[PDB]
Design a protein around this ligand. Structure first.
Ligand code: FAD
Ligand code: HEM
Ligand code: HEM
Length: 399
């Protein structure tokens, strides 16, 4: 759910709508519903830019994309009502036909957005990018319909133009510029290690020092013959300065390609560090819960803090001993650090993680990284036991 950590972002949405409505209600009341939709559309594009301000305002990128989907639905509902109240299925003049085409493209794209199971991610993104064409068609419709009412020196013109320009710039940046100018960390793959039958560790030497905090992730672009160059999110699993570690589990065609065919010496690009699961900023007492590859952020901390400064109970749940990674590293860390408690749960034979019996520290922060299904029950049990325990969770998807 949403909390005060996102309130600023929420305020930015709410102030966006009221200021829009009060504007239209003052100039063209008959156009509150379309105009609001326009503002909403703009916000949708602004919510896709992955800018650090967005993460600061909405806490996490997952909440950013949740609000992005909400603005999309609000836009489409308002646009459908506007079409019903002010037209039919095809316009009589070019200005109305632009709106017809724009609304058809918007509806089709929103319908296809919930077709990700049947569509590869890159094809999904390429289909999704038609929102820019729909937005341009809608802007053309709006401006040829309104004429000089939106080209004068008044509040309505400034508001409409400002939101339209912000949406246009956000869409252009995310579609055409983000992968070309916003990936300034150029690196070379120097070492690869296969941890088990389906997980590979990648070591990257960068041209510049990379600043991150343990528990954060980054978008990686790989440049190799036979590899896709689309950015994929991976948690940083160690390294400092000009060295980075990423631990990739096989979960699809691209990650299987990484496990099988990735070569040392290939080019990689990284943009920046994302994430709200900063372990070093938590309480003194901490409980770590990792499911499978969700161990990747905590490992980073272990690799960057040889002497543990917190009281940590780590629960690592894996589906069989063949699916476990970094067991020797975790055992060495537990032996070296008396304040580190290690609980290895083989879910095939030991059952599952149950917190109805295990104790929790009083003033404790609980970090969760793993499947949402098994994290939800654990969070419910922990909240039932100690309702004031701080809880942070990070998932491995956006849609
Ligand atoms: C914040 C975050 C941190 C992550 N950290 C790790 C990590 O440390 N180790 C690890 O092994 N995996 C991690 N992942 C998951 C990793 O991003 C996916 O496994 C990978 O991108 C899927 O590639 P694929 O083509 O092999 O999978 P596919 O078979 O194409 O898809 C499988 C799943 O991955 C999603 N997916 C596919 N391509 C992308 C993409 N370009 N961007 C986003 N999602 C995509 C799909 O929506 C689907 O849910 C993380 C994901 C997120 C969001
Ligand atoms: C009017 C409606 C919408 C507009 C204008 C819009 C706009 C955009 C744009 C321009 C991008 C950038 C794509 C790129 O990287 O090239 C994007 C990404 C994204 N959109 Fe939308 N979108 C809309 C609706 C939706 C819906 C309905 C969903 C989910 C059901 C959604 C989820 C996402 C996600 C998850 C991403 C990021 C995917 C990734 O980069 O991995 N959006 N959106
Ligand atoms: C400030 C914003 C907007 C204003 C002032 C506005 C104004 C109008 C007007 C005056 C009409 C009547 C046209 C006619 O009767 O021929 C109309 C129709 C229409 N508009 Fe908009 N519009 C706005 C935004 C949008 C957007 C963003 C879209 C689509 C993305 C859209 C889609 C449509 C559609 C589909 C019609 C139906 C036309 C028809 O079939 O006759 N409108 N709008």
């Amino acid at each position: 759910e949403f909390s005060m950590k996102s309130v600023k972002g929420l305020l930015f949405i709410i102030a966006s709508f009221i200021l829009t409505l009060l504007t239209w209600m003052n100039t063209s009341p008959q156009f509150m519903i379309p105009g609001l939709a326009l503002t909403s559309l703009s916000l949708t594009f602004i919510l896709a830019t992955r800018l650090p301000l967005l993460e600061s305002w909405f806490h996490s990128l997952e909440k950013v994309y949740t609000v992005h989907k909400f603005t999309a639905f609000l836009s489409i509902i308002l646009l459908i009502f506007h079409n019903f109240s002010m037209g039919g299925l095809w316009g009589s003049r070019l200005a109305a036909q632009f709106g017809n085409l724009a609304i058809y493209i918007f509806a089709s794209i929103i319908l296809v957005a919930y077709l990700g199971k049947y569509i590869q991610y890159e094809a999904w993104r390429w289909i999704h990018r038609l929102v820019y064409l729909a937005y341009i068609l809608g802007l053309f419709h709006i401006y040829m319909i309104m004429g000089n009412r939106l080209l004068t020196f008044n509040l309505l013109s400034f508001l409409v133009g400002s939101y339209a320009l912000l949406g246009l710039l956000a869409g252009f940046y995310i579609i055409f510029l983000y992968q070309k100018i916003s990936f300034p960390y150029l690196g070379k793959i120097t070492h690869l290690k296969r941890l088990n039958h389906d997980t590979r560790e990648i070591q990257i030497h960068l041209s510049r020092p990379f600043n991150y905090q343990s528990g954060q992730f980054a978008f990686l672009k790989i440049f190799q013959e036979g590899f896709e160059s689309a950015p994929h999110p991976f948690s940083i699993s160690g390294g400092h300065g000009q060295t980075l570690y990423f631990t990739v589990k096989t979960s699809g065609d691209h990650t299987k390609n990484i496990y099988d065919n990735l070569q040392a010496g290939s080019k990689v690009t990284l943009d920046r560090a994302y994430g709200h699961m900063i372990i070093e900023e938590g309480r003194e007492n901490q409980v770590w819960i990792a499911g499978g590859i969700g161990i990747t952020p905590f490992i980073s901390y272990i690799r960057e803090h040889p002497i543990l400064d917190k009281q940590v109970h780590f629960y690592y749940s894996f589906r069989g001993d063949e699916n476990a990674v970094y067991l020797d590293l975790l055992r060495n860390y537990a032996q070296k650090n008396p304040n580190f408690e290690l609980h290895l749960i083989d879910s095939t034979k030991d059952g599952y993680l149950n917190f109805e019996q295990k104790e929790v520290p009083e003033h404790a922060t609980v970090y969760m990284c793993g499947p949402i299904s098994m994290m939800k029950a654990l969070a419910k049990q922990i909240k039932k036991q100690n309702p004031k325990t701080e809880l942070i969770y990070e998932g491995f998807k956006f849609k």
